[PDB]
């Protein structure tokens, strides 16, 4: 089997991407944030504290003939941005782009933090990291991908995120029309539960490539590119007037700037992030200070190849017995 679903930016900055997902019988379609940096499939629901729901579409398990309470199971998750959610668990039929999993754990939110409430466009998350990170207790649950894997034509999924445009998540096949050149594969460590890999270096603009190992995670659920302070300083030093602002919470730059590209290494291959992808616009409405899309990972504890990086590539998440990651230009 295979699946193919379009993923759409939630706003004009590509802050996140939503993908329609069918849950239950008859289908209830919710728009979920596919997150390769976490491993819970959770939704706004009929159980979510009413004051914490503001425009989201909810899953109502009592209206699904295939929903079953997973008795005694609870979940609770905290994300890197400080947001959180928790609740109980149902199993139900879940379909993505025509690919169906029966008995998928669907984590129903009883509580969500303010950042989730305030984002009316995101009805929940669909985790695509390794199932060892799943938070369900006392019986840990599998991700949608883990459950689907045995049925797939090939044990893979691909992320093809757009810059200010829709893109695609495919399951079970590699669309050879969706990228240019060849795919370069690189080793993955699953020790922390992430799609963790080592970039071979970077360049700023038309500058020389610096060969240096940068361990980080491929994380579709993080907006920006978070890299070591040395790398980030070297980038922003090429932008007149750019500075790190503790008051704003990162590097800012004059909105009048033209940003240089940023290149990262995948083995001997190179992925180029155009400068425009690094512009996250005014820090506040009408400001002439703009927020940068490359930020320091110092104090996160991990480097993160978020959407800024991933949307410059066609990315293969290879879930074979020995997982690997592939990157191609597009």
PDB file of C-alpha atoms in Angstrom:
ATOM      1  CA  UNK A   1       0.000   0.000   0.000  1.00  0.00           C
ATOM      2  CA  UNK A   2       0.871   3.679  -0.266  1.00  0.00           C
ATOM      3  CA  UNK A   3      -0.531   7.043   0.780  1.00  0.00           C
ATOM      4  CA  UNK A   4      -0.098  10.569  -0.540  1.00  0.00           C
ATOM      5  CA  UNK A   5      -1.405  13.736   1.127  1.00  0.00           C
ATOM      6  CA  UNK A   6      -0.925  17.427   0.475  1.00  0.00           C
ATOM      7  CA  UNK A   7       0.477  19.526   3.312  1.00  0.00           C
ATOM      8  CA  UNK A   8      -0.325  23.257   3.440  1.00  0.00           C
ATOM      9  CA  UNK A   9       1.323  26.136   5.336  1.00  0.00           C
ATOM     10  CA  UNK A  10      -0.900  27.503   8.116  1.00  0.00           C
ATOM     11  CA  UNK A  11       0.065  31.118   7.445  1.00  0.00           C
ATOM     12  CA  UNK A  12       2.097  33.430   5.242  1.00  0.00           C
ATOM     13  CA  UNK A  13       5.333  32.675   7.144  1.00  0.00           C
ATOM     14  CA  UNK A  14       5.210  28.871   6.870  1.00  0.00           C
ATOM     15  CA  UNK A  15       5.090  28.693  10.677  1.00  0.00           C
ATOM     16  CA  UNK A  16       3.803  25.118  10.385  1.00  0.00           C
ATOM     17  CA  UNK A  17       2.097  22.825   7.903  1.00  0.00           C
ATOM     18  CA  UNK A  18      -1.225  21.010   8.166  1.00  0.00           C
ATOM     19  CA  UNK A  19      -2.236  17.781   6.477  1.00  0.00           C
ATOM     20  CA  UNK A  20      -5.808  16.409   6.407  1.00  0.00           C
ATOM     21  CA  UNK A  21      -6.283  13.116   8.275  1.00  0.00           C
ATOM     22  CA  UNK A  22      -9.411  10.944   8.362  1.00  0.00           C
ATOM     23  CA  UNK A  23     -10.270   9.512  11.798  1.00  0.00           C
ATOM     24  CA  UNK A  24     -13.115   7.180  12.643  1.00  0.00           C
ATOM     25  CA  UNK A  25     -16.234   5.859  10.949  1.00  0.00           C
ATOM     26  CA  UNK A  26     -17.802   7.787   9.300  1.00  0.00           C
ATOM     27  CA  UNK A  27     -14.638   9.764   8.680  1.00  0.00           C
ATOM     28  CA  UNK A  28     -13.934  12.855  10.739  1.00  0.00           C
ATOM     29  CA  UNK A  29     -11.329  14.943   8.921  1.00  0.00           C
ATOM     30  CA  UNK A  30      -8.914  16.897  11.114  1.00  0.00           C
ATOM     31  CA  UNK A  31      -5.950  18.972   9.950  1.00  0.00           C
ATOM     32  CA  UNK A  32      -2.890  17.712  11.789  1.00  0.00           C
ATOM     33  CA  UNK A  33       0.683  18.967  12.129  1.00  0.00           C
ATOM     34  CA  UNK A  34       2.920  16.077  10.995  1.00  0.00           C
ATOM     35  CA  UNK A  35       5.879  16.141  13.373  1.00  0.00           C
ATOM     36  CA  UNK A  36       8.990  14.047  12.732  1.00  0.00           C
ATOM     37  CA  UNK A  37      10.283  15.284  16.114  1.00  0.00           C
ATOM     38  CA  UNK A  38       7.619  13.580  18.273  1.00  0.00           C
ATOM     39  CA  UNK A  39       5.715  10.330  18.459  1.00  0.00           C
ATOM     40  CA  UNK A  40       2.166  11.010  19.661  1.00  0.00           C
ATOM     41  CA  UNK A  41      -0.919  11.331  17.457  1.00  0.00           C
ATOM     42  CA  UNK A  42      -3.146  13.621  19.511  1.00  0.00           C
ATOM     43  CA  UNK A  43      -6.242  15.613  18.662  1.00  0.00           C
ATOM     44  CA  UNK A  44      -8.548  18.288  19.903  1.00  0.00           C
ATOM     45  CA  UNK A  45     -11.680  16.405  20.889  1.00  0.00           C
ATOM     46  CA  UNK A  46     -15.103  16.436  22.501  1.00  0.00           C
ATOM     47  CA  UNK A  47     -13.167  15.865  25.763  1.00  0.00           C
ATOM     48  CA  UNK A  48     -10.999  18.996  25.455  1.00  0.00           C
ATOM     49  CA  UNK A  49     -11.669  21.625  28.143  1.00  0.00           C
ATOM     50  CA  UNK A  50     -14.127  23.947  26.404  1.00  0.00           C
ATOM     51  CA  UNK A  51     -12.291  27.173  27.278  1.00  0.00           C
ATOM     52  CA  UNK A  52      -9.163  25.746  25.589  1.00  0.00           C
ATOM     53  CA  UNK A  53     -10.880  25.209  22.223  1.00  0.00           C
ATOM     54  CA  UNK A  54     -11.002  28.221  19.880  1.00  0.00           C
ATOM     55  CA  UNK A  55     -11.897  27.341  16.302  1.00  0.00           C
ATOM     56  CA  UNK A  56     -10.301  23.892  15.990  1.00  0.00           C
ATOM     57  CA  UNK A  57     -12.146  20.952  14.500  1.00  0.00           C
ATOM     58  CA  UNK A  58     -12.634  18.277  17.142  1.00  0.00           C
ATOM     59  CA  UNK A  59     -12.674  14.493  17.103  1.00  0.00           C
ATOM     60  CA  UNK A  60     -15.783  13.060  18.772  1.00  0.00           C
ATOM     61  CA  UNK A  61     -15.157   9.394  19.529  1.00  0.00           C
ATOM     62  CA  UNK A  62     -18.791   8.770  20.504  1.00  0.00           C
ATOM     63  CA  UNK A  63     -19.749   9.475  16.865  1.00  0.00           C
ATOM     64  CA  UNK A  64     -17.297   6.875  15.512  1.00  0.00           C
ATOM     65  CA  UNK A  65     -18.527   3.294  15.248  1.00  0.00           C
ATOM     66  CA  UNK A  66     -14.918   2.057  15.221  1.00  0.00           C
ATOM     67  CA  UNK A  67     -13.647   4.042  18.252  1.00  0.00           C
ATOM     68  CA  UNK A  68     -12.801   2.109  21.416  1.00  0.00           C
ATOM     69  CA  UNK A  69     -11.516   3.507  24.688  1.00  0.00           C
ATOM     70  CA  UNK A  70      -8.028   2.221  25.442  1.00  0.00           C
ATOM     71  CA  UNK A  71      -8.931   1.589  29.047  1.00  0.00           C
ATOM     72  CA  UNK A  72      -6.604   3.068  31.644  1.00  0.00           C
ATOM     73  CA  UNK A  73      -4.277   4.715  29.140  1.00  0.00           C
ATOM     74  CA  UNK A  74      -3.236   8.336  29.570  1.00  0.00           C
ATOM     75  CA  UNK A  75      -0.744  10.598  27.841  1.00  0.00           C
ATOM     76  CA  UNK A  76       1.051  13.851  28.559  1.00  0.00           C
ATOM     77  CA  UNK A  77       3.577  15.629  26.372  1.00  0.00           C
ATOM     78  CA  UNK A  78       5.736  18.741  26.529  1.00  0.00           C
ATOM     79  CA  UNK A  79       7.402  20.188  23.453  1.00  0.00           C
ATOM     80  CA  UNK A  80      10.608  22.158  22.952  1.00  0.00           C
ATOM     81  CA  UNK A  81       8.729  25.448  22.664  1.00  0.00           C
ATOM     82  CA  UNK A  82       7.208  24.959  26.120  1.00  0.00           C
ATOM     83  CA  UNK A  83       3.772  23.950  24.874  1.00  0.00           C
ATOM     84  CA  UNK A  84       1.988  20.883  26.194  1.00  0.00           C
ATOM     85  CA  UNK A  85      -1.123  18.732  26.076  1.00  0.00           C
ATOM     86  CA  UNK A  86      -2.516  15.662  27.845  1.00  0.00           C
ATOM     87  CA  UNK A  87      -5.512  13.360  28.001  1.00  0.00           C
ATOM     88  CA  UNK A  88      -6.755   9.820  27.459  1.00  0.00           C
ATOM     89  CA  UNK A  89      -6.663   7.411  24.515  1.00  0.00           C
ATOM     90  CA  UNK A  90      -8.927   5.729  21.973  1.00  0.00           C
ATOM     91  CA  UNK A  91      -8.097   3.317  19.219  1.00  0.00           C
ATOM     92  CA  UNK A  92      -9.717   4.026  15.872  1.00  0.00           C
ATOM     93  CA  UNK A  93      -9.211   3.804  12.114  1.00  0.00           C
ATOM     94  CA  UNK A  94      -6.914   6.515  10.765  1.00  0.00           C
ATOM     95  CA  UNK A  95      -6.280   7.250   7.086  1.00  0.00           C
ATOM     96  CA  UNK A  96      -3.722   9.571   5.509  1.00  0.00           C
ATOM     97  CA  UNK A  97      -3.844  10.202   1.786  1.00  0.00           C
ATOM     98  CA  UNK A  98      -5.592   6.897   1.130  1.00  0.00           C
ATOM     99  CA  UNK A  99      -3.414   4.782   3.469  1.00  0.00           C
ATOM    100  CA  UNK A 100      -5.427   3.243   6.300  1.00  0.00           C
ATOM    101  CA  UNK A 101      -4.326   1.949   9.710  1.00  0.00           C
ATOM    102  CA  UNK A 102      -6.832   0.156  11.915  1.00  0.00           C
ATOM    103  CA  UNK A 103      -6.382   0.198  15.687  1.00  0.00           C
ATOM    104  CA  UNK A 104      -4.280   3.375  15.697  1.00  0.00           C
ATOM    105  CA  UNK A 105      -3.897   5.054  19.091  1.00  0.00           C
ATOM    106  CA  UNK A 106      -5.670   8.405  18.863  1.00  0.00           C
ATOM    107  CA  UNK A 107      -4.767  10.465  21.905  1.00  0.00           C
ATOM    108  CA  UNK A 108      -7.702  12.656  22.915  1.00  0.00           C
ATOM    109  CA  UNK A 109      -6.754  15.948  24.569  1.00  0.00           C
ATOM    110  CA  UNK A 110      -8.407  16.868  27.821  1.00  0.00           C
ATOM    111  CA  UNK A 111      -6.046  19.838  28.223  1.00  0.00           C
ATOM    112  CA  UNK A 112      -3.903  21.861  25.835  1.00  0.00           C
ATOM    113  CA  UNK A 113      -1.622  24.812  26.505  1.00  0.00           C
ATOM    114  CA  UNK A 114      -2.305  28.321  25.285  1.00  0.00           C
ATOM    115  CA  UNK A 115      -0.173  28.100  22.143  1.00  0.00           C
ATOM    116  CA  UNK A 116      -2.382  25.275  20.874  1.00  0.00           C
ATOM    117  CA  UNK A 117      -5.644  27.039  21.765  1.00  0.00           C
ATOM    118  CA  UNK A 118      -4.436  30.180  20.013  1.00  0.00           C
ATOM    119  CA  UNK A 119      -3.712  28.332  16.782  1.00  0.00           C
ATOM    120  CA  UNK A 120      -7.130  27.691  15.279  1.00  0.00           C
ATOM    121  CA  UNK A 121      -5.646  26.038  12.183  1.00  0.00           C
ATOM    122  CA  UNK A 122      -4.015  23.049  13.925  1.00  0.00           C
ATOM    123  CA  UNK A 123      -6.411  20.338  15.130  1.00  0.00           C
ATOM    124  CA  UNK A 124      -3.639  18.161  16.612  1.00  0.00           C
ATOM    125  CA  UNK A 125      -0.305  16.520  15.877  1.00  0.00           C
ATOM    126  CA  UNK A 126       0.697  13.333  14.096  1.00  0.00           C
ATOM    127  CA  UNK A 127       4.070  12.159  15.378  1.00  0.00           C
ATOM    128  CA  UNK A 128       6.543  10.547  13.005  1.00  0.00           C
ATOM    129  CA  UNK A 129       9.633  10.123  15.215  1.00  0.00           C
ATOM    130  CA  UNK A 130      10.423   6.700  16.699  1.00  0.00           C
ATOM    131  CA  UNK A 131       7.759   5.020  18.816  1.00  0.00           C
ATOM    132  CA  UNK A 132      10.148   4.856  21.800  1.00  0.00           C
ATOM    133  CA  UNK A 133       9.227   8.533  22.416  1.00  0.00           C
ATOM    134  CA  UNK A 134       5.482   7.891  22.586  1.00  0.00           C
ATOM    135  CA  UNK A 135       4.095   9.148  25.902  1.00  0.00           C
ATOM    136  CA  UNK A 136       1.130   6.803  26.421  1.00  0.00           C
ATOM    137  CA  UNK A 137       1.165   5.085  29.826  1.00  0.00           C
ATOM    138  CA  UNK A 138       1.131   2.358  31.029  1.00  0.00           C
ATOM    139  CA  UNK A 139       1.311   0.762  27.566  1.00  0.00           C
ATOM    140  CA  UNK A 140       3.379   2.733  25.067  1.00  0.00           C
ATOM    141  CA  UNK A 141       1.776   3.073  21.629  1.00  0.00           C
ATOM    142  CA  UNK A 142       3.070   3.002  18.064  1.00  0.00           C
ATOM    143  CA  UNK A 143       3.111   5.863  15.584  1.00  0.00           C
ATOM    144  CA  UNK A 144       0.976   5.850  12.455  1.00  0.00           C
ATOM    145  CA  UNK A 145       4.104   5.108  10.392  1.00  0.00           C
ATOM    146  CA  UNK A 146       5.184   2.233  12.647  1.00  0.00           C
ATOM    147  CA  UNK A 147       1.712   0.695  12.398  1.00  0.00           C
ATOM    148  CA  UNK A 148       1.546   1.161   8.610  1.00  0.00           C
ATOM    149  CA  UNK A 149       5.077   0.024   7.863  1.00  0.00           C
ATOM    150  CA  UNK A 150       4.536  -3.676   7.264  1.00  0.00           C
ATOM    151  CA  UNK A 151       1.783  -2.928   4.743  1.00  0.00           C
ATOM    152  CA  UNK A 152       3.724  -0.320   2.787  1.00  0.00           C
ATOM    153  CA  UNK A 153       5.311  -1.079  -0.579  1.00  0.00           C
ATOM    154  CA  UNK A 154       8.577   0.259   0.894  1.00  0.00           C
ATOM    155  CA  UNK A 155       9.159   1.144   4.585  1.00  0.00           C
ATOM    156  CA  UNK A 156       9.566   4.866   3.979  1.00  0.00           C
ATOM    157  CA  UNK A 157       7.839   8.193   4.091  1.00  0.00           C
ATOM    158  CA  UNK A 158       8.907  11.409   2.396  1.00  0.00           C
ATOM    159  CA  UNK A 159       8.535  15.075   3.273  1.00  0.00           C
ATOM    160  CA  UNK A 160       8.363  17.590   0.434  1.00  0.00           C
ATOM    161  CA  UNK A 161       7.519  20.875   2.139  1.00  0.00           C
ATOM    162  CA  UNK A 162       6.821  24.001   0.103  1.00  0.00           C
ATOM    163  CA  UNK A 163       8.142  27.519   0.507  1.00  0.00           C
ATOM    164  CA  UNK A 164       5.016  29.669   0.795  1.00  0.00           C
ATOM    165  CA  UNK A 165       3.199  26.883  -1.060  1.00  0.00           C
ATOM    166  CA  UNK A 166       1.669  23.443  -0.529  1.00  0.00           C
ATOM    167  CA  UNK A 167       3.788  20.308  -0.559  1.00  0.00           C
ATOM    168  CA  UNK A 168       3.396  16.572  -0.027  1.00  0.00           C
ATOM    169  CA  UNK A 169       3.822  13.755   2.480  1.00  0.00           C
ATOM    170  CA  UNK A 170       4.079  10.352   0.791  1.00  0.00           C
ATOM    171  CA  UNK A 171       4.023   6.973   2.529  1.00  0.00           C
ATOM    172  CA  UNK A 172       5.422   3.792   1.049  1.00  0.00           C
ATOM    173  CA  UNK A 173       7.083   5.108  -2.114  1.00  0.00           C
ATOM    174  CA  UNK A 174       9.604   7.588  -3.435  1.00  0.00           C
ATOM    175  CA  UNK A 175       8.207   9.907  -6.136  1.00  0.00           C
ATOM    176  CA  UNK A 176      11.145  10.127  -8.516  1.00  0.00           C
ATOM    177  CA  UNK A 177       9.488  13.109 -10.253  1.00  0.00           C
ATOM    178  CA  UNK A 178       9.555  15.207  -7.063  1.00  0.00           C
ATOM    179  CA  UNK A 179      13.294  15.928  -6.902  1.00  0.00           C
ATOM    180  CA  UNK A 180      16.251  16.734  -9.125  1.00  0.00           C
ATOM    181  CA  UNK A 181      19.538  14.860  -9.318  1.00  0.00           C
ATOM    182  CA  UNK A 182      20.098  11.990  -6.905  1.00  0.00           C
ATOM    183  CA  UNK A 183      19.166  11.294  -3.282  1.00  0.00           C
ATOM    184  CA  UNK A 184      22.072  11.217  -0.827  1.00  0.00           C
ATOM    185  CA  UNK A 185      21.492   8.931   2.138  1.00  0.00           C
ATOM    186  CA  UNK A 186      23.115   9.422   5.521  1.00  0.00           C
ATOM    187  CA  UNK A 187      23.202   7.439   8.771  1.00  0.00           C
ATOM    188  CA  UNK A 188      20.637   7.866  11.536  1.00  0.00           C
ATOM    189  CA  UNK A 189      20.980   7.325  15.263  1.00  0.00           C
ATOM    190  CA  UNK A 190      17.739   6.342  16.978  1.00  0.00           C
ATOM    191  CA  UNK A 191      19.304   6.513  20.453  1.00  0.00           C
ATOM    192  CA  UNK A 192      17.322   9.625  21.443  1.00  0.00           C
ATOM    193  CA  UNK A 193      14.199   8.574  19.510  1.00  0.00           C
ATOM    194  CA  UNK A 194      14.715  11.146  16.769  1.00  0.00           C
ATOM    195  CA  UNK A 195      15.728  11.124  13.124  1.00  0.00           C
ATOM    196  CA  UNK A 196      19.191  12.170  14.260  1.00  0.00           C
ATOM    197  CA  UNK A 197      21.974  12.516  11.699  1.00  0.00           C
ATOM    198  CA  UNK A 198      25.275  14.352  11.157  1.00  0.00           C
ATOM    199  CA  UNK A 199      25.634  17.100   8.583  1.00  0.00           C
ATOM    200  CA  UNK A 200      29.081  17.388   7.020  1.00  0.00           C
ATOM    201  CA  UNK A 201      29.301  21.194   7.156  1.00  0.00           C
ATOM    202  CA  UNK A 202      28.018  24.494   5.893  1.00  0.00           C
ATOM    203  CA  UNK A 203      28.570  27.558   3.747  1.00  0.00           C
ATOM    204  CA  UNK A 204      27.213  31.098   3.989  1.00  0.00           C
ATOM    205  CA  UNK A 205      26.167  32.679   0.701  1.00  0.00           C
ATOM    206  CA  UNK A 206      28.851  32.251  -1.937  1.00  0.00           C
ATOM    207  CA  UNK A 207      31.463  31.555   0.750  1.00  0.00           C
ATOM    208  CA  UNK A 208      33.726  28.557   1.028  1.00  0.00           C
ATOM    209  CA  UNK A 209      32.302  25.363   2.504  1.00  0.00           C
ATOM    210  CA  UNK A 210      33.407  24.620   6.072  1.00  0.00           C
ATOM    211  CA  UNK A 211      33.797  20.900   6.690  1.00  0.00           C
ATOM    212  CA  UNK A 212      32.589  20.219  10.209  1.00  0.00           C
ATOM    213  CA  UNK A 213      30.312  17.591  11.773  1.00  0.00           C
ATOM    214  CA  UNK A 214      26.966  18.940  12.994  1.00  0.00           C
ATOM    215  CA  UNK A 215      24.760  16.406  14.765  1.00  0.00           C
ATOM    216  CA  UNK A 216      21.078  17.312  14.640  1.00  0.00           C
ATOM    217  CA  UNK A 217      17.534  16.121  14.075  1.00  0.00           C
ATOM    218  CA  UNK A 218      15.256  16.302  11.044  1.00  0.00           C
ATOM    219  CA  UNK A 219      12.146  17.867  12.612  1.00  0.00           C
ATOM    220  CA  UNK A 220       9.161  18.872  10.503  1.00  0.00           C
ATOM    221  CA  UNK A 221       7.412  20.132  13.638  1.00  0.00           C
ATOM    222  CA  UNK A 222       9.991  22.876  14.283  1.00  0.00           C
ATOM    223  CA  UNK A 223       9.717  26.018  12.166  1.00  0.00           C
ATOM    224  CA  UNK A 224      13.318  27.258  12.147  1.00  0.00           C
ATOM    225  CA  UNK A 225      16.882  26.004  11.699  1.00  0.00           C
ATOM    226  CA  UNK A 226      18.725  25.819  15.042  1.00  0.00           C
ATOM    227  CA  UNK A 227      22.495  25.382  14.798  1.00  0.00           C
ATOM    228  CA  UNK A 228      25.581  25.929  16.975  1.00  0.00           C
ATOM    229  CA  UNK A 229      26.303  29.500  17.992  1.00  0.00           C
ATOM    230  CA  UNK A 230      29.535  29.590  15.983  1.00  0.00           C
ATOM    231  CA  UNK A 231      27.705  28.684  12.751  1.00  0.00           C
ATOM    232  CA  UNK A 232      24.832  31.083  13.391  1.00  0.00           C
ATOM    233  CA  UNK A 233      27.180  33.974  14.203  1.00  0.00           C
ATOM    234  CA  UNK A 234      29.075  33.336  10.951  1.00  0.00           C
ATOM    235  CA  UNK A 235      25.794  33.528   9.020  1.00  0.00           C
ATOM    236  CA  UNK A 236      24.418  36.718  10.576  1.00  0.00           C
ATOM    237  CA  UNK A 237      27.803  38.466  10.387  1.00  0.00           C
ATOM    238  CA  UNK A 238      27.152  38.639   6.625  1.00  0.00           C
ATOM    239  CA  UNK A 239      23.960  40.700   7.106  1.00  0.00           C
ATOM    240  CA  UNK A 240      24.471  44.420   7.797  1.00  0.00           C
ATOM    241  CA  UNK A 241      22.732  45.428  10.997  1.00  0.00           C
ATOM    242  CA  UNK A 242      21.877  41.908  12.146  1.00  0.00           C
ATOM    243  CA  UNK A 243      22.206  41.249  15.863  1.00  0.00           C
ATOM    244  CA  UNK A 244      21.122  38.891  18.579  1.00  0.00           C
ATOM    245  CA  UNK A 245      18.398  40.466  20.684  1.00  0.00           C
ATOM    246  CA  UNK A 246      17.732  39.025  24.131  1.00  0.00           C
ATOM    247  CA  UNK A 247      14.523  41.075  24.308  1.00  0.00           C
ATOM    248  CA  UNK A 248      13.155  39.542  21.102  1.00  0.00           C
ATOM    249  CA  UNK A 249      14.629  36.085  21.711  1.00  0.00           C
ATOM    250  CA  UNK A 250      17.087  35.628  18.875  1.00  0.00           C
ATOM    251  CA  UNK A 251      18.737  37.105  15.837  1.00  0.00           C
ATOM    252  CA  UNK A 252      16.947  39.963  14.119  1.00  0.00           C
ATOM    253  CA  UNK A 253      17.916  41.859  11.007  1.00  0.00           C
ATOM    254  CA  UNK A 254      16.808  44.972   9.120  1.00  0.00           C
ATOM    255  CA  UNK A 255      13.769  44.261   7.010  1.00  0.00           C
ATOM    256  CA  UNK A 256      15.552  46.164   4.195  1.00  0.00           C
ATOM    257  CA  UNK A 257      18.224  43.444   3.944  1.00  0.00           C
ATOM    258  CA  UNK A 258      18.740  40.902   1.210  1.00  0.00           C
ATOM    259  CA  UNK A 259      19.675  37.675   3.023  1.00  0.00           C
ATOM    260  CA  UNK A 260      22.420  35.332   1.842  1.00  0.00           C
ATOM    261  CA  UNK A 261      21.708  31.671   1.221  1.00  0.00           C
ATOM    262  CA  UNK A 262      22.830  28.974   3.641  1.00  0.00           C
ATOM    263  CA  UNK A 263      24.221  25.622   2.473  1.00  0.00           C
ATOM    264  CA  UNK A 264      24.351  22.458   4.565  1.00  0.00           C
ATOM    265  CA  UNK A 265      26.210  19.255   3.769  1.00  0.00           C
ATOM    266  CA  UNK A 266      24.726  15.785   3.447  1.00  0.00           C
ATOM    267  CA  UNK A 267      27.710  13.536   2.892  1.00  0.00           C
ATOM    268  CA  UNK A 268      29.422  14.948  -0.186  1.00  0.00           C
ATOM    269  CA  UNK A 269      26.160  16.550  -1.357  1.00  0.00           C
ATOM    270  CA  UNK A 270      24.942  20.062  -0.623  1.00  0.00           C
ATOM    271  CA  UNK A 271      21.475  21.495   0.064  1.00  0.00           C
ATOM    272  CA  UNK A 272      21.091  25.226  -0.523  1.00  0.00           C
ATOM    273  CA  UNK A 273      18.545  27.190   1.508  1.00  0.00           C
ATOM    274  CA  UNK A 274      17.746  30.411  -0.414  1.00  0.00           C
ATOM    275  CA  UNK A 275      18.037  33.618   1.574  1.00  0.00           C
ATOM    276  CA  UNK A 276      14.323  34.326   1.268  1.00  0.00           C
ATOM    277  CA  UNK A 277      13.566  31.136   3.235  1.00  0.00           C
ATOM    278  CA  UNK A 278      15.422  32.657   6.212  1.00  0.00           C
ATOM    279  CA  UNK A 279      13.129  35.725   6.420  1.00  0.00           C
ATOM    280  CA  UNK A 280      10.415  35.398   9.074  1.00  0.00           C
ATOM    281  CA  UNK A 281       9.193  38.941   8.710  1.00  0.00           C
ATOM    282  CA  UNK A 282       8.601  41.763  11.151  1.00  0.00           C
ATOM    283  CA  UNK A 283       9.061  40.938  14.830  1.00  0.00           C
ATOM    284  CA  UNK A 284       5.771  42.718  15.527  1.00  0.00           C
ATOM    285  CA  UNK A 285       3.247  44.135  13.115  1.00  0.00           C
ATOM    286  CA  UNK A 286       4.688  47.089  11.209  1.00  0.00           C
ATOM    287  CA  UNK A 287       8.207  46.815  12.624  1.00  0.00           C
ATOM    288  CA  UNK A 288      11.276  47.286  10.425  1.00  0.00           C
ATOM    289  CA  UNK A 289      13.123  44.655  12.482  1.00  0.00           C
ATOM    290  CA  UNK A 290      12.705  41.182  11.016  1.00  0.00           C
ATOM    291  CA  UNK A 291      13.130  37.806  12.715  1.00  0.00           C
ATOM    292  CA  UNK A 292      15.763  35.422  11.429  1.00  0.00           C
ATOM    293  CA  UNK A 293      15.105  31.866  10.320  1.00  0.00           C
ATOM    294  CA  UNK A 294      18.507  30.577  11.497  1.00  0.00           C
ATOM    295  CA  UNK A 295      18.891  30.715  15.268  1.00  0.00           C
ATOM    296  CA  UNK A 296      21.282  29.376  17.891  1.00  0.00           C
ATOM    297  CA  UNK A 297      20.669  25.954  19.414  1.00  0.00           C
ATOM    298  CA  UNK A 298      22.717  26.899  22.484  1.00  0.00           C
ATOM    299  CA  UNK A 299      20.660  25.919  25.509  1.00  0.00           C
ATOM    300  CA  UNK A 300      18.277  23.682  23.526  1.00  0.00           C
ATOM    301  CA  UNK A 301      20.744  20.845  23.863  1.00  0.00           C
ATOM    302  CA  UNK A 302      20.290  19.668  20.275  1.00  0.00           C
ATOM    303  CA  UNK A 303      20.632  21.082  16.776  1.00  0.00           C
ATOM    304  CA  UNK A 304      17.381  21.091  14.823  1.00  0.00           C
ATOM    305  CA  UNK A 305      16.974  20.933  11.062  1.00  0.00           C
ATOM    306  CA  UNK A 306      13.462  22.347  11.097  1.00  0.00           C
ATOM    307  CA  UNK A 307      11.210  23.456   8.270  1.00  0.00           C
ATOM    308  CA  UNK A 308      13.578  26.227   7.058  1.00  0.00           C
ATOM    309  CA  UNK A 309      16.105  23.538   6.146  1.00  0.00           C
ATOM    310  CA  UNK A 310      13.782  20.691   5.209  1.00  0.00           C
ATOM    311  CA  UNK A 311      11.654  22.709   2.782  1.00  0.00           C
ATOM    312  CA  UNK A 312      14.786  23.275   0.650  1.00  0.00           C
ATOM    313  CA  UNK A 313      14.966  19.508   0.036  1.00  0.00           C
ATOM    314  CA  UNK A 314      13.082  16.363  -0.830  1.00  0.00           C
ATOM    315  CA  UNK A 315      13.600  14.301   2.342  1.00  0.00           C
ATOM    316  CA  UNK A 316      13.338  10.523   2.681  1.00  0.00           C
ATOM    317  CA  UNK A 317      12.669   9.057   6.114  1.00  0.00           C
ATOM    318  CA  UNK A 318      13.787   5.469   5.590  1.00  0.00           C
ATOM    319  CA  UNK A 319      12.344   3.211   8.271  1.00  0.00           C
ATOM    320  CA  UNK A 320      14.048   0.012   7.150  1.00  0.00           C
ATOM    321  CA  UNK A 321      15.612  -2.228   9.792  1.00  0.00           C
ATOM    322  CA  UNK A 322      18.569   0.158   9.813  1.00  0.00           C
ATOM    323  CA  UNK A 323      16.969   3.586   9.401  1.00  0.00           C
ATOM    324  CA  UNK A 324      18.573   6.270   7.247  1.00  0.00           C
ATOM    325  CA  UNK A 325      17.724   9.755   5.957  1.00  0.00           C
ATOM    326  CA  UNK A 326      17.920  10.835   2.325  1.00  0.00           C
ATOM    327  CA  UNK A 327      18.145  14.355   0.942  1.00  0.00           C
ATOM    328  CA  UNK A 328      17.778  15.572  -2.633  1.00  0.00           C
ATOM    329  CA  UNK A 329      17.566  19.006  -4.164  1.00  0.00           C
ATOM    330  CA  UNK A 330      14.291  19.899  -5.882  1.00  0.00           C
TER     331      UNK A 330
END
